[PDB]
């Protein structure tokens, strides 16, 4: 009922590639153990970075930066988290020794946030940056972090990005070693 508007925020959506095929090929107990280990790592990483996980929807995972506490480096902070996230997914092997490939989408812009007290994920975030971020994950290529121009312009001096081959998007490659 109570909605709060944030002018600046950055939103991440992460989604497992091929999880239907994984879930159909894995015993239910081992699938639960795999997902719990992956999400326990993700949850730890979120609090380590001081961010907030807003929604976990099956094999989807939504993280916000700048809400409820605004920070001037909200886009840069989410980018460092996203790179840690994909590296965690790359190093975390199932009992078969295969990584769990992700699609990750990042966006920045205004959001609205509110408390829905009767829910588990009782703090909801919606709005422009959430809608763009979901688009970025939706159309992402396997294993990449896809971002729009507005994110690119905020990361380009500290991070390496490559333009994806009307809307132009970019792949977040990693942190610059030196400027």
């Amino acid at each position, epitope marked *: 009922i109570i909605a709060d508007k944030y002018d600046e925020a950055s939103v991440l959506f992460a989604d497992i590639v091929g999880f239907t095929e994984r879930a159909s090929s894995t015993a239910p107990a081992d699938l639960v153990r795999f997902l719990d280990r992956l999400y326990s790592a993700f949850d730890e990483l979120v609090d380590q*970075h*001081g961010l907030e996980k807003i929604k976990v929807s099956g094999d989807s995972y939504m993280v916000v930066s700048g809400v409820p506490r605004p920070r001037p480096d909200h886009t840069q902070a989410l980018a460092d988290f996203a790179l840690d996230m994909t590296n965690v997914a790359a*190093q*975390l092997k199932d009992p078969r020794g295969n990584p769990v490939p992700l699609r990750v989408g990042l966006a920045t812009g205004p959001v609205v946030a509110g408390v829905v007290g009767s829910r588990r994920f009782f703090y909801d975030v919606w709005g422009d940056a959430v809608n763009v971020a979901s688009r970025m994950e939706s159309t992402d290529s396997v294993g990449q972090i896809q971002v729009p121009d507005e994110v690119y312009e905020r990361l380009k001096d500290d991070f390496v990005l490559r333009e994806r081959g009307v809307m132009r998007t970019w792949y977040l490659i990693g942190r610059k*070693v030196a400027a």
Partner: nanobody, 116 residues
């Protein structure tokens, strides 16, 4: 080879101070996150301090205000200054990247003992 060797541990009495170092070789510190963890035994390694590549720091509630994590990119090393030490802080301390933590690749750590 990719390794992380901790050092600086030892014996101190309550209220004392220690400075732990974590030297990294095989990775470039400036593009990686680094965290410090402790294993008492009543649990597995819990994280107490975390430094991102942009310089953000966060700490566990139990140690915040008393511990400070910091970086030295030239030496490719991360530090944990420990102040106002308590018996509850006695543990083996390790450093690790997020990838090393989920990968289970740990160094041998450094012992910190708080007693008289």
């Amino acid at each position: 080879q990719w390794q992380l060797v901790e050092s600086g541990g030892g014996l101190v009495q309550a209220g004392g101070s220690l400075r732990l170092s974590c030297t990294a070789s095989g990775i470039i510190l400036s593009i990686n996150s680094m965290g410090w963890y402790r294993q008492t035994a009543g649990n597995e390694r819990e994280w107490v301090a975390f430094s991102t590549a942009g310089g953000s720091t966060t700490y566990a509630d139990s140690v915040k205000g008393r511990f400070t994590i910091s970086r030295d990119n030239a030496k490719n090393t991360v530090y944990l200054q420990m102040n106002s030490l308590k018996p509850e802080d006695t543990a083996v301390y390790y450093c690790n990247t997020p990838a090393g933590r989920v990968g289970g690749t740990w160094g041998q750590g450094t012992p910190v003992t708080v007693s008289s």
